[PDB]
Design a protein around this ligand. Structure first.
Ligand SMILES: *Nc1ccc2c(c1)Cc1ccccc1-2
Length: 580
DNA sequence: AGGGATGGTGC
DNA sequence: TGCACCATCCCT
Protein backbone atom coordinates (compact mmCIF):
# COMPACT_ATOMS: atom_id res chain seq x y z
CA UNK A 1 0.00 0.00 0.00
CA UNK A 2 2.83 2.40 0.90
CA UNK A 3 3.62 4.99 -1.77
CA UNK A 4 7.16 5.21 -3.11
CA UNK A 5 9.11 8.46 -2.93
CA UNK A 6 12.58 9.83 -2.30
CA UNK A 7 13.23 11.48 1.06
CA UNK A 8 15.80 13.86 -0.46
CA UNK A 9 18.63 15.39 1.58
CA UNK A 10 19.42 17.85 -1.22
CA UNK A 11 17.64 19.38 -4.22
CA UNK A 12 18.28 17.85 -7.66
CA UNK A 13 17.59 19.07 -11.21
CA UNK A 14 15.12 16.20 -11.55
CA UNK A 15 12.98 17.98 -8.95
CA UNK A 16 12.89 21.15 -11.04
CA UNK A 17 10.89 19.93 -14.06
CA UNK A 18 8.69 22.50 -15.83
CA UNK A 19 5.44 20.78 -14.74
CA UNK A 20 4.73 19.41 -11.29
CA UNK A 21 2.32 18.96 -8.40
CA UNK A 22 3.73 21.04 -5.53
CA UNK A 23 2.99 20.88 -1.81
CA UNK A 24 4.35 23.57 0.54
CA UNK A 25 2.72 22.56 3.83
CA UNK A 26 1.62 25.16 6.37
CA UNK A 27 -0.28 23.41 9.16
CA UNK A 28 -1.18 26.49 11.22
CA UNK A 29 -4.70 27.61 10.24
CA UNK A 30 -3.60 31.25 10.09
CA UNK A 31 -0.68 31.00 7.66
CA UNK A 32 0.67 34.51 8.26
CA UNK A 33 4.37 34.34 9.21
CA UNK A 34 3.73 30.65 9.90
CA UNK A 35 6.09 27.69 9.52
CA UNK A 36 6.34 25.54 6.42
CA UNK A 37 6.69 22.02 7.84
CA UNK A 38 7.64 20.18 4.68
CA UNK A 39 7.68 20.12 0.89
CA UNK A 40 6.55 17.51 -1.62
CA UNK A 41 7.13 17.49 -5.37
CA UNK A 42 5.63 15.04 -7.86
CA UNK A 43 6.53 15.15 -11.53
CA UNK A 44 7.35 12.96 -14.53
CA UNK A 45 10.61 11.98 -12.81
CA UNK A 46 8.98 10.73 -9.61
CA UNK A 47 7.89 11.72 -6.11
CA UNK A 48 10.10 13.69 -3.71
CA UNK A 49 9.94 15.00 -0.16
CA UNK A 50 12.14 17.95 0.84
CA UNK A 51 12.84 19.39 4.27
CA UNK A 52 11.95 23.11 4.18
CA UNK A 53 15.15 24.33 5.84
CA UNK A 54 17.00 22.69 2.93
CA UNK A 55 14.75 23.45 -0.04
CA UNK A 56 14.06 27.06 0.88
CA UNK A 57 17.78 27.71 1.35
CA UNK A 58 18.66 26.27 -2.07
CA UNK A 59 19.13 28.94 -4.78
CA UNK A 60 17.99 26.59 -7.55
CA UNK A 61 14.81 25.53 -5.75
CA UNK A 62 13.91 29.12 -4.89
CA UNK A 63 14.52 30.11 -8.50
CA UNK A 64 12.29 27.26 -9.68
CA UNK A 65 9.56 28.49 -7.31
CA UNK A 66 9.69 31.98 -8.78
CA UNK A 67 9.91 30.96 -12.44
CA UNK A 68 6.53 31.55 -14.07
CA UNK A 69 7.47 29.14 -16.88
CA UNK A 70 7.77 26.24 -14.42
CA UNK A 71 4.14 25.23 -13.91
CA UNK A 72 2.90 23.96 -10.57
CA UNK A 73 -0.39 22.30 -9.63
CA UNK A 74 -1.42 22.81 -6.01
CA UNK A 75 -4.17 22.87 -3.40
CA UNK A 76 -4.73 26.28 -1.76
CA UNK A 77 -1.79 27.98 -3.47
CA UNK A 78 -2.63 31.25 -1.70
CA UNK A 79 -1.73 29.68 1.65
CA UNK A 80 1.66 28.63 0.26
CA UNK A 81 2.19 31.93 -1.56
CA UNK A 82 1.56 34.06 1.53
CA UNK A 83 3.63 31.87 3.85
CA UNK A 84 6.43 32.22 1.31
CA UNK A 85 5.90 35.99 1.03
CA UNK A 86 6.67 36.25 4.75
CA UNK A 87 9.96 34.44 4.06
CA UNK A 88 10.78 36.74 1.15
CA UNK A 89 10.19 34.02 -1.44
CA UNK A 90 8.06 34.51 -4.56
CA UNK A 91 5.82 31.73 -5.87
CA UNK A 92 4.96 31.90 -9.58
CA UNK A 93 3.67 29.54 -12.26
CA UNK A 94 0.73 28.07 -10.37
CA UNK A 95 -1.42 26.91 -13.28
CA UNK A 96 -3.92 24.81 -11.32
CA UNK A 97 -5.39 25.04 -7.82
CA UNK A 98 -7.41 21.96 -6.85
CA UNK A 99 -9.13 23.79 -3.97
CA UNK A 100 -10.57 26.46 -6.28
CA UNK A 101 -11.46 23.84 -8.91
CA UNK A 102 -13.42 21.80 -6.37
CA UNK A 103 -15.08 24.98 -5.06
CA UNK A 104 -16.31 25.97 -8.54
CA UNK A 105 -17.55 22.46 -9.32
CA UNK A 106 -19.64 22.33 -6.14
CA UNK A 107 -19.42 24.93 -3.32
CA UNK A 108 -21.75 22.80 -1.19
CA UNK A 109 -19.33 19.89 -0.90
CA UNK A 110 -17.27 21.95 1.54
CA UNK A 111 -13.91 20.78 0.21
CA UNK A 112 -11.24 21.98 2.64
CA UNK A 113 -8.47 19.45 2.08
CA UNK A 114 -7.03 17.35 -0.72
CA UNK A 115 -8.77 14.19 0.46
CA UNK A 116 -12.21 15.82 0.26
CA UNK A 117 -11.55 16.94 -3.31
CA UNK A 118 -10.10 13.57 -4.37
CA UNK A 119 -13.15 11.78 -2.98
CA UNK A 120 -15.30 13.59 -5.59
CA UNK A 121 -13.58 11.46 -8.24
CA UNK A 122 -13.51 8.26 -6.19
CA UNK A 123 -9.81 8.69 -5.37
CA UNK A 124 -9.05 7.74 -1.76
CA UNK A 125 -5.31 6.98 -1.65
CA UNK A 126 -4.75 10.02 0.60
CA UNK A 127 -5.79 10.81 4.18
CA UNK A 128 -7.83 13.81 5.37
CA UNK A 129 -5.58 16.43 6.97
CA UNK A 130 -7.47 16.23 10.26
CA UNK A 131 -6.67 12.51 10.47
CA UNK A 132 -2.95 13.22 10.17
CA UNK A 133 -2.63 16.42 12.21
CA UNK A 134 -5.37 15.74 14.72
CA UNK A 135 -7.71 18.53 15.82
CA UNK A 136 -7.67 21.30 18.41
CA UNK A 137 -5.43 20.97 21.46
CA UNK A 138 -4.29 17.55 20.24
CA UNK A 139 -3.21 19.08 16.93
CA UNK A 140 0.42 18.41 16.07
CA UNK A 141 2.88 17.78 13.25
CA UNK A 142 3.64 14.03 13.16
CA UNK A 143 7.11 12.50 12.80
CA UNK A 144 8.96 12.84 9.49
CA UNK A 145 8.06 9.39 8.07
CA UNK A 146 4.34 10.01 8.60
CA UNK A 147 4.56 13.65 7.54
CA UNK A 148 6.48 12.92 4.33
CA UNK A 149 4.13 10.19 3.14
CA UNK A 150 1.10 12.39 3.73
CA UNK A 151 2.57 15.29 1.74
CA UNK A 152 3.65 12.98 -1.08
CA UNK A 153 0.19 11.39 -1.29
CA UNK A 154 -1.40 14.85 -1.45
CA UNK A 155 0.98 15.86 -4.23
CA UNK A 156 0.26 12.55 -5.97
CA UNK A 157 -3.51 13.11 -5.74
CA UNK A 158 -3.17 16.60 -7.20
CA UNK A 159 -0.93 15.26 -9.97
CA UNK A 160 -3.56 12.62 -10.85
CA UNK A 161 -6.68 14.75 -10.37
CA UNK A 162 -5.76 17.84 -12.39
CA UNK A 163 -6.96 16.38 -15.70
CA UNK A 164 -10.34 15.00 -14.57
CA UNK A 165 -11.10 18.22 -12.67
CA UNK A 166 -10.17 20.44 -15.64
CA UNK A 167 -12.23 18.25 -17.99
CA UNK A 168 -15.33 18.54 -15.83
CA UNK A 169 -14.86 22.30 -15.52
CA UNK A 170 -14.72 22.47 -19.33
CA UNK A 171 -17.94 20.42 -19.62
CA UNK A 172 -19.53 22.84 -17.14
CA UNK A 173 -18.13 25.74 -19.19
CA UNK A 174 -16.26 26.88 -16.07
CA UNK A 175 -12.63 26.43 -17.14
CA UNK A 176 -12.21 30.14 -17.88
CA UNK A 177 -13.85 31.01 -14.54
CA UNK A 178 -11.06 29.04 -12.85
CA UNK A 179 -8.11 30.00 -15.07
CA UNK A 180 -9.04 33.60 -15.87
CA UNK A 181 -10.88 34.67 -12.70
CA UNK A 182 -10.39 32.69 -9.47
CA UNK A 183 -6.73 31.71 -9.88
CA UNK A 184 -5.57 35.20 -10.85
CA UNK A 185 -7.72 36.59 -8.03
CA UNK A 186 -6.02 34.20 -5.60
CA UNK A 187 -2.69 35.99 -6.25
CA UNK A 188 -4.33 39.38 -5.71
CA UNK A 189 -5.89 38.29 -2.41
CA UNK A 190 -2.44 37.01 -1.37
CA UNK A 191 -0.96 40.48 -1.92
CA UNK A 192 -3.82 42.10 0.02
CA UNK A 193 -3.51 39.82 3.05
CA UNK A 194 0.28 40.12 3.09
CA UNK A 195 0.13 43.95 2.90
CA UNK A 196 -2.39 44.07 5.73
CA UNK A 197 -4.06 47.14 7.20
CA UNK A 198 -2.38 49.51 9.66
CA UNK A 199 -4.16 50.00 12.98
CA UNK A 200 -3.97 52.96 15.36
CA UNK A 201 -3.80 50.85 18.53
CA UNK A 202 -3.53 53.89 20.79
CA UNK A 203 -6.85 55.10 19.39
CA UNK A 204 -8.42 51.68 19.92
CA UNK A 205 -7.06 51.43 23.46
CA UNK A 206 -8.47 54.85 24.34
CA UNK A 207 -11.87 53.92 22.90
CA UNK A 208 -11.71 50.74 24.94
CA UNK A 209 -11.07 52.75 28.09
CA UNK A 210 -14.08 55.00 27.50
CA UNK A 211 -16.29 51.99 26.74
CA UNK A 212 -15.28 50.26 29.97
CA UNK A 213 -16.37 53.37 31.85
CA UNK A 214 -19.77 53.63 30.15
CA UNK A 215 -20.20 49.87 30.41
CA UNK A 216 -19.58 50.01 34.16
CA UNK A 217 -22.02 52.89 34.52
CA UNK A 218 -24.82 51.25 32.53
CA UNK A 219 -24.16 47.95 34.29
CA UNK A 220 -24.71 49.45 37.74
CA UNK A 221 -27.84 51.22 36.51
CA UNK A 222 -29.17 47.87 35.27
CA UNK A 223 -28.74 46.23 38.69
CA UNK A 224 -30.34 49.28 40.29
CA UNK A 225 -33.41 48.97 38.05
CA UNK A 226 -33.54 45.20 38.58
CA UNK A 227 -33.11 45.38 42.34
CA UNK A 228 -30.20 42.93 42.21
CA UNK A 229 -27.05 41.93 40.32
CA UNK A 230 -26.86 39.20 37.68
CA UNK A 231 -25.01 38.21 34.51
CA UNK A 232 -26.58 40.50 31.93
CA UNK A 233 -24.81 38.37 29.30
CA UNK A 234 -26.69 35.15 30.08
CA UNK A 235 -30.03 34.93 28.21
CA UNK A 236 -30.98 32.54 31.01
CA UNK A 237 -30.52 34.85 34.00
CA UNK A 238 -31.61 37.86 31.95
CA UNK A 239 -34.86 36.10 31.10
CA UNK A 240 -35.63 35.44 34.76
CA UNK A 241 -35.22 39.14 35.59
CA UNK A 242 -37.24 40.43 32.63
CA UNK A 243 -40.02 37.87 32.28
CA UNK A 244 -40.30 36.58 35.84
CA UNK A 245 -39.15 39.24 38.31
CA UNK A 246 -40.25 42.27 36.26
CA UNK A 247 -43.20 40.48 34.65
CA UNK A 248 -42.50 41.74 31.14
CA UNK A 249 -44.68 40.04 28.49
CA UNK A 250 -43.30 37.11 26.52
CA UNK A 251 -43.73 38.07 22.87
CA UNK A 252 -41.19 35.52 21.62
CA UNK A 253 -40.05 32.09 22.80
CA UNK A 254 -36.79 30.24 22.17
CA UNK A 255 -35.90 26.53 22.13
CA UNK A 256 -34.56 26.93 25.67
CA UNK A 257 -36.46 29.63 27.48
CA UNK A 258 -37.21 33.26 26.68
CA UNK A 259 -36.08 35.28 23.66
CA UNK A 260 -34.13 38.48 24.37
CA UNK A 261 -33.00 39.56 20.91
CA UNK A 262 -32.80 43.31 20.23
CA UNK A 263 -35.98 43.33 18.13
CA UNK A 264 -37.86 41.78 21.06
CA UNK A 265 -36.41 44.19 23.62
CA UNK A 266 -37.26 47.25 21.53
CA UNK A 267 -40.92 46.22 21.79
CA UNK A 268 -40.66 45.83 25.57
CA UNK A 269 -38.97 49.20 26.17
CA UNK A 270 -42.23 51.06 26.96
CA UNK A 271 -42.91 48.71 29.89
CA UNK A 272 -39.72 49.21 31.88
CA UNK A 273 -36.66 51.48 31.94
CA UNK A 274 -34.37 48.47 32.39
CA UNK A 275 -34.88 47.46 28.76
CA UNK A 276 -33.28 50.49 27.09
CA UNK A 277 -30.32 50.10 29.45
CA UNK A 278 -29.95 46.42 28.50
CA UNK A 279 -30.04 47.40 24.83
CA UNK A 280 -27.42 50.09 25.43
CA UNK A 281 -25.29 47.69 27.49
CA UNK A 282 -25.27 45.18 24.62
CA UNK A 283 -24.37 47.84 22.05
CA UNK A 284 -21.31 48.91 24.04
CA UNK A 285 -20.44 45.33 24.96
CA UNK A 286 -20.49 44.28 21.31
CA UNK A 287 -18.06 47.07 20.44
CA UNK A 288 -15.80 46.35 23.41
CA UNK A 289 -15.59 42.56 23.18
CA UNK A 290 -15.86 41.86 19.46
CA UNK A 291 -14.19 44.91 17.95
CA UNK A 292 -11.93 46.71 20.43
CA UNK A 293 -10.58 43.66 22.28
CA UNK A 294 -11.01 41.36 19.29
CA UNK A 295 -8.98 43.62 17.02
CA UNK A 296 -6.26 44.34 19.57
CA UNK A 297 -5.71 40.58 19.94
CA UNK A 298 -4.82 40.11 16.27
CA UNK A 299 -2.79 43.25 15.55
CA UNK A 300 0.90 42.44 15.01
CA UNK A 301 2.83 44.46 17.64
CA UNK A 302 5.89 44.81 15.44
CA UNK A 303 4.01 46.53 12.61
CA UNK A 304 0.66 47.42 14.16
CA UNK A 305 -1.06 45.80 11.17
CA UNK A 306 -3.85 43.22 11.00
CA UNK A 307 -3.52 40.55 8.30
CA UNK A 308 -6.89 39.01 7.51
CA UNK A 309 -7.33 35.83 5.52
CA UNK A 310 -9.88 35.90 2.73
CA UNK A 311 -11.41 32.45 2.41
CA UNK A 312 -11.89 32.21 -1.36
CA UNK A 313 -13.47 28.75 -1.44
CA UNK A 314 -16.26 28.82 1.12
CA UNK A 315 -19.48 30.75 0.45
CA UNK A 316 -22.31 29.21 -1.55
CA UNK A 317 -22.76 32.38 -3.59
CA UNK A 318 -19.21 33.04 -4.77
CA UNK A 319 -18.46 35.77 -2.24
CA UNK A 320 -15.30 35.83 -0.16
CA UNK A 321 -15.32 35.61 3.64
CA UNK A 322 -12.82 37.24 6.03
CA UNK A 323 -11.32 35.93 9.28
CA UNK A 324 -8.95 36.71 12.14
CA UNK A 325 -9.91 39.41 11.91
CA UNK A 326 -13.11 39.63 9.90
CA UNK A 327 -12.70 42.98 8.18
CA UNK A 328 -15.96 42.61 6.26
CA UNK A 329 -18.21 43.34 9.23
CA UNK A 330 -16.68 46.43 10.88
CA UNK A 331 -19.58 48.63 12.08
CA UNK A 332 -20.83 51.60 10.06
CA UNK A 333 -24.60 51.92 10.49
CA UNK A 334 -24.53 53.40 14.00
CA UNK A 335 -22.22 56.36 14.59
CA UNK A 336 -20.78 55.02 17.84
CA UNK A 337 -19.68 51.78 16.24
CA UNK A 338 -18.69 53.59 13.06
CA UNK A 339 -16.00 55.46 15.01
CA UNK A 340 -14.13 52.13 15.13
CA UNK A 341 -13.07 52.84 11.54
CA UNK A 342 -10.99 55.82 12.65
CA UNK A 343 -8.56 53.18 13.97
CA UNK A 344 -7.81 51.87 10.47
CA UNK A 345 -5.19 54.12 8.91
CA UNK A 346 -2.82 54.30 5.88
CA UNK A 347 0.36 52.23 6.24
CA UNK A 348 2.63 55.08 5.11
CA UNK A 349 2.97 58.76 5.95
CA UNK A 350 1.11 61.07 3.57
CA UNK A 351 -0.97 58.20 2.16
CA UNK A 352 -4.76 58.08 2.29
CA UNK A 353 -7.53 55.47 2.38
CA UNK A 354 -9.69 55.33 -0.80
CA UNK A 355 -12.99 53.44 -0.89
CA UNK A 356 -15.20 52.73 -3.90
CA UNK A 357 -18.55 50.97 -3.77
CA UNK A 358 -21.07 49.80 -6.36
CA UNK A 359 -24.40 51.58 -6.04
CA UNK A 360 -27.14 48.90 -5.97
CA UNK A 361 -25.23 46.32 -7.99
CA UNK A 362 -27.61 43.55 -6.89
CA UNK A 363 -30.76 45.27 -8.17
CA UNK A 364 -28.96 46.36 -11.35
CA UNK A 365 -27.91 42.74 -11.92
CA UNK A 366 -31.56 41.76 -11.30
CA UNK A 367 -32.81 44.31 -13.85
CA UNK A 368 -30.32 42.83 -16.32
CA UNK A 369 -31.07 39.13 -15.85
CA UNK A 370 -34.86 39.53 -15.59
CA UNK A 371 -34.84 42.09 -18.40
CA UNK A 372 -37.60 43.95 -16.55
CA UNK A 373 -38.51 47.04 -18.59
CA UNK A 374 -39.53 49.13 -15.59
CA UNK A 375 -36.53 48.24 -13.42
CA UNK A 376 -34.07 48.74 -16.31
CA UNK A 377 -35.60 52.15 -17.14
CA UNK A 378 -35.32 53.11 -13.46
CA UNK A 379 -31.58 52.45 -13.39
CA UNK A 380 -31.05 54.03 -16.82
CA UNK A 381 -32.48 57.17 -15.21
CA UNK A 382 -30.29 56.52 -12.15
CA UNK A 383 -33.40 56.91 -10.00
CA UNK A 384 -33.58 56.54 -6.24
CA UNK A 385 -34.60 52.87 -6.44
CA UNK A 386 -36.44 52.81 -3.09
CA UNK A 387 -38.45 55.95 -3.82
CA UNK A 388 -39.24 54.56 -7.28
CA UNK A 389 -40.33 51.21 -5.82
CA UNK A 390 -42.53 53.05 -3.29
CA UNK A 391 -44.12 55.09 -6.09
CA UNK A 392 -45.01 51.93 -8.01
CA UNK A 393 -46.29 49.62 -5.25
CA UNK A 394 -48.24 52.41 -3.52
CA UNK A 395 -49.36 54.05 -6.78
CA UNK A 396 -48.32 57.58 -5.88
CA UNK A 397 -46.27 60.44 -7.32
CA UNK A 398 -42.70 61.08 -6.16
CA UNK A 399 -43.83 64.05 -4.04
CA UNK A 400 -46.40 61.78 -2.40
CA UNK A 401 -43.79 59.31 -1.11
CA UNK A 402 -43.56 59.63 2.67
CA UNK A 403 -40.51 58.56 4.70
CA UNK A 404 -42.35 55.48 5.97
CA UNK A 405 -43.40 54.51 2.45
CA UNK A 406 -39.77 54.63 1.27
CA UNK A 407 -38.68 52.67 4.32
CA UNK A 408 -41.09 49.84 3.55
CA UNK A 409 -40.31 49.89 -0.18
CA UNK A 410 -36.64 49.63 0.81
CA UNK A 411 -37.43 46.64 3.02
CA UNK A 412 -39.05 44.97 0.03
CA UNK A 413 -35.93 45.57 -2.07
CA UNK A 414 -33.65 44.44 0.77
CA UNK A 415 -35.68 41.24 0.82
CA UNK A 416 -35.23 40.70 -2.91
CA UNK A 417 -31.50 41.43 -2.82
CA UNK A 418 -30.96 38.96 0.03
CA UNK A 419 -33.71 36.44 -0.68
CA UNK A 420 -35.14 36.56 2.83
CA UNK A 421 -38.17 34.42 3.69
CA UNK A 422 -41.70 35.82 3.56
CA UNK A 423 -41.63 35.60 7.35
CA UNK A 424 -38.44 37.64 7.58
CA UNK A 425 -40.12 40.34 5.48
CA UNK A 426 -43.36 40.51 7.48
CA UNK A 427 -41.27 41.30 10.55
CA UNK A 428 -38.91 43.74 8.85
CA UNK A 429 -42.15 45.56 8.06
CA UNK A 430 -43.51 44.54 11.47
CA UNK A 431 -46.74 43.43 9.80
CA UNK A 432 -48.73 40.24 9.15
CA UNK A 433 -47.65 37.54 6.71
CA UNK A 434 -50.93 38.06 4.88
CA UNK A 435 -50.17 41.75 4.36
CA UNK A 436 -46.55 41.04 3.44
CA UNK A 437 -47.47 38.73 0.57
CA UNK A 438 -49.78 41.54 -0.53
CA UNK A 439 -46.84 43.94 -0.86
CA UNK A 440 -44.94 41.43 -2.98
CA UNK A 441 -48.00 41.01 -5.19
CA UNK A 442 -48.06 44.75 -5.89
CA UNK A 443 -44.34 44.68 -6.63
CA UNK A 444 -44.76 41.97 -9.27
CA UNK A 445 -47.48 44.00 -10.96
CA UNK A 446 -45.01 46.89 -11.26
CA UNK A 447 -42.10 44.61 -12.15
CA UNK A 448 -43.65 41.72 -14.16
CA UNK A 449 -40.23 40.91 -15.60
CA UNK A 450 -38.87 40.19 -12.13
CA UNK A 451 -41.91 37.99 -11.55
CA UNK A 452 -41.31 35.97 -14.73
CA UNK A 453 -37.60 35.62 -13.85
CA UNK A 454 -38.42 34.28 -10.38
CA UNK A 455 -40.86 31.77 -11.85
CA UNK A 456 -38.50 30.79 -14.67
CA UNK A 457 -35.38 30.43 -12.51
CA UNK A 458 -37.19 28.19 -10.02
CA UNK A 459 -38.31 26.02 -12.94
CA UNK A 460 -34.78 25.97 -14.39
CA UNK A 461 -33.27 24.98 -11.03
CA UNK A 462 -35.67 22.07 -10.90
CA UNK A 463 -34.95 21.05 -14.50
CA UNK A 464 -31.17 21.35 -14.52
CA UNK A 465 -30.64 20.73 -10.82
CA UNK A 466 -28.67 23.95 -10.32
CA UNK A 467 -28.65 27.68 -11.13
CA UNK A 468 -25.78 29.74 -12.57
CA UNK A 469 -24.32 33.24 -12.46
CA UNK A 470 -23.17 35.56 -15.27
CA UNK A 471 -19.67 34.07 -15.31
CA UNK A 472 -20.95 30.48 -14.95
CA UNK A 473 -20.49 29.90 -11.24
CA UNK A 474 -22.99 27.28 -10.11
CA UNK A 475 -24.95 26.14 -7.11
CA UNK A 476 -26.81 22.84 -6.92
CA UNK A 477 -30.26 22.99 -5.31
CA UNK A 478 -31.42 19.42 -4.59
CA UNK A 479 -34.03 20.68 -2.09
CA UNK A 480 -35.90 22.38 -4.91
CA UNK A 481 -37.83 19.10 -5.35
CA UNK A 482 -38.48 18.43 -1.65
CA UNK A 483 -42.06 17.69 -0.59
CA UNK A 484 -41.47 19.61 2.64
CA UNK A 485 -42.84 23.11 2.07
CA UNK A 486 -40.32 24.95 4.22
CA UNK A 487 -37.29 23.08 2.89
CA UNK A 488 -38.46 23.53 -0.70
CA UNK A 489 -39.28 27.22 -0.20
CA UNK A 490 -35.73 27.91 0.99
CA UNK A 491 -34.28 26.23 -2.10
CA UNK A 492 -36.61 28.31 -4.26
CA UNK A 493 -35.35 31.48 -2.58
CA UNK A 494 -31.76 30.41 -3.31
CA UNK A 495 -32.59 29.73 -6.95
CA UNK A 496 -33.80 33.32 -7.21
CA UNK A 497 -31.05 34.84 -5.06
CA UNK A 498 -27.88 33.03 -6.19
CA UNK A 499 -27.84 34.40 -9.76
CA UNK A 500 -28.17 37.87 -8.22
CA UNK A 501 -25.66 37.61 -5.36
CA UNK A 502 -23.35 35.34 -7.33
CA UNK A 503 -23.28 37.56 -10.39
CA UNK A 504 -22.49 40.57 -8.20
CA UNK A 505 -19.61 38.54 -6.74
CA UNK A 506 -18.37 37.61 -10.23
CA UNK A 507 -18.35 41.25 -11.31
CA UNK A 508 -16.43 42.74 -8.39
CA UNK A 509 -13.91 39.88 -8.66
CA UNK A 510 -13.24 40.69 -12.31
CA UNK A 511 -13.08 44.37 -11.35
CA UNK A 512 -10.28 43.57 -8.90
CA UNK A 513 -8.28 41.77 -11.59
CA UNK A 514 -8.91 44.55 -14.13
CA UNK A 515 -8.00 47.19 -11.52
CA UNK A 516 -4.68 45.60 -10.57
CA UNK A 517 -3.74 45.40 -14.24
CA UNK A 518 -4.50 49.12 -14.61
CA UNK A 519 -2.63 50.13 -11.46
CA UNK A 520 0.42 48.27 -12.78
CA UNK A 521 0.21 49.79 -16.28
CA UNK A 522 0.03 53.24 -14.69
CA UNK A 523 2.81 52.37 -12.22
CA UNK A 524 0.66 53.72 -9.39
CA UNK A 525 1.76 52.88 -5.85
CA UNK A 526 -1.89 52.50 -4.84
CA UNK A 527 -2.90 49.01 -3.81
CA UNK A 528 -5.93 47.03 -2.71
CA UNK A 529 -6.34 46.44 1.00
CA UNK A 530 -9.83 45.00 1.30
CA UNK A 531 -12.94 43.91 -0.56
CA UNK A 532 -16.27 44.05 1.23
CA UNK A 533 -18.68 42.32 -1.19
CA UNK A 534 -19.68 45.37 -3.24
CA UNK A 535 -16.80 47.71 -2.47
CA UNK A 536 -13.03 47.93 -2.74
CA UNK A 537 -10.80 49.61 -0.17
CA UNK A 538 -7.34 50.86 -1.15
CA UNK A 539 -4.58 53.08 0.24
CA UNK A 540 -2.21 55.26 -1.78
CA UNK A 541 -0.02 58.38 -1.72
CA UNK A 542 -2.11 61.52 -1.32
CA UNK A 543 -0.68 62.54 -4.69
CA UNK A 544 -2.57 59.69 -6.41
CA UNK A 545 -6.07 60.48 -5.14
CA UNK A 546 -7.19 62.57 -8.12
CA UNK A 547 -6.12 59.86 -10.54
CA UNK A 548 -7.77 57.12 -8.47
CA UNK A 549 -11.03 59.12 -8.42
CA UNK A 550 -11.26 58.62 -12.17
CA UNK A 551 -9.57 55.24 -12.58
CA UNK A 552 -11.15 53.06 -9.90
CA UNK A 553 -14.84 53.86 -10.63
CA UNK A 554 -14.29 53.48 -14.39
CA UNK A 555 -12.59 50.08 -14.00
CA UNK A 556 -15.28 48.86 -11.61
CA UNK A 557 -18.09 50.18 -13.81
CA UNK A 558 -16.64 48.63 -16.98
CA UNK A 559 -15.71 45.22 -15.50
CA UNK A 560 -18.77 43.78 -17.29
CA UNK A 561 -21.39 45.20 -19.68
CA UNK A 562 -25.03 44.87 -18.61
CA UNK A 563 -28.35 46.01 -20.10
CA UNK A 564 -28.16 48.77 -17.50
CA UNK A 565 -25.24 50.95 -16.42
CA UNK A 566 -23.14 50.07 -13.39
CA UNK A 567 -22.53 53.00 -11.02
CA UNK A 568 -19.71 53.35 -8.48
CA UNK A 569 -19.45 55.96 -5.72
CA UNK A 570 -16.15 56.82 -4.03
CA UNK A 571 -14.59 58.67 -1.09
CA UNK A 572 -11.16 59.03 0.51
CA UNK A 573 -9.64 60.38 3.71
CA UNK A 574 -6.97 60.05 6.40
CA UNK A 575 -8.70 57.04 7.97
CA UNK A 576 -11.22 54.40 6.88
CA UNK A 577 -13.90 56.30 8.80
CA UNK A 578 -13.10 59.41 6.76
CA UNK A 579 -13.33 57.59 3.44
CA UNK A 580 -17.03 58.18 4.07
C1' DA B 1 -11.06 21.67 26.31
C1' DG B 2 -15.06 21.42 22.62
C1' DG B 3 -19.25 23.01 20.72
C1' DG B 4 -24.39 23.93 20.53
C1' DA B 5 -27.70 27.92 21.58
C1' DT B 6 -28.39 32.75 21.30
C1' DG B 7 -27.42 37.32 19.84
C1' DG B 8 -25.32 40.92 16.59
C1' DT B 9 -22.25 43.04 13.24
C1' DG B 10 -21.48 43.42 7.72
C1' DC B 11 -23.31 43.12 2.60
C1' DT C 1 -32.58 34.70 10.34
C1' DG C 2 -31.00 35.05 3.03
C1' DC C 3 -24.29 34.93 2.49
C1' DA C 4 -20.84 35.29 6.17
C1' DC C 5 -17.77 35.58 11.38
C1' DC C 6 -17.55 35.52 16.21
C1' DA C 7 -18.74 37.13 20.92
C1' DT C 8 -20.27 35.00 25.83
C1' DC C 9 -22.66 31.55 28.35
C1' DC C 10 -22.75 26.96 29.88
C1' DC C 11 -23.51 21.82 29.49
C1' DT C 12 -20.56 17.73 28.76
N1 LIG D 1 -32.82 35.91 5.17
C1 LIG D 1 -33.57 36.21 6.41
C2 LIG D 1 -34.31 35.14 7.02
C3 LIG D 1 -35.06 35.33 8.21
C4 LIG D 1 -35.08 36.64 8.81
C5 LIG D 1 -34.34 37.74 8.20
C6 LIG D 1 -33.59 37.51 7.00
C7 LIG D 1 -34.50 39.04 9.01
C8 LIG D 1 -35.41 38.52 10.13
C9 LIG D 1 -35.95 39.23 11.25
C10 LIG D 1 -36.78 38.54 12.17
C11 LIG D 1 -37.08 37.15 12.00
C12 LIG D 1 -36.56 36.42 10.90
C13 LIG D 1 -35.71 37.10 9.95
Amino acid sequence: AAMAFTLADRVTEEMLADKAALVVEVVEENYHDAPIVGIAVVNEHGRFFLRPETALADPQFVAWLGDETKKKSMFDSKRAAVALKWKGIELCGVSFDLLLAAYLLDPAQGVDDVAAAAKMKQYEAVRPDEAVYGKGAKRAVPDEPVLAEHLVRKAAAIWELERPFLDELRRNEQDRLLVELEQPLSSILAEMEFAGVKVDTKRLEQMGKELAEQLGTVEQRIYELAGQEFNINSPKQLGVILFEKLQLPVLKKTKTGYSTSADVLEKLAPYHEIVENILHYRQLGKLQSTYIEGLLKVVRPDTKKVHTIFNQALTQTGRLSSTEPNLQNIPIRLEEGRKIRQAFVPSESDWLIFAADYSQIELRVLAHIAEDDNLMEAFRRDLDIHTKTAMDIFQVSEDEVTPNMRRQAKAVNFGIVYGISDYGLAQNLNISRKEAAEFIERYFESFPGVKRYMENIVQEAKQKGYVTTLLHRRRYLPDITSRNFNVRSFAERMAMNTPIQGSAADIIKKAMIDLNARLKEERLQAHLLLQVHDELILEAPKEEMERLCRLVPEVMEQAVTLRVPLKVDYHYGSTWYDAK
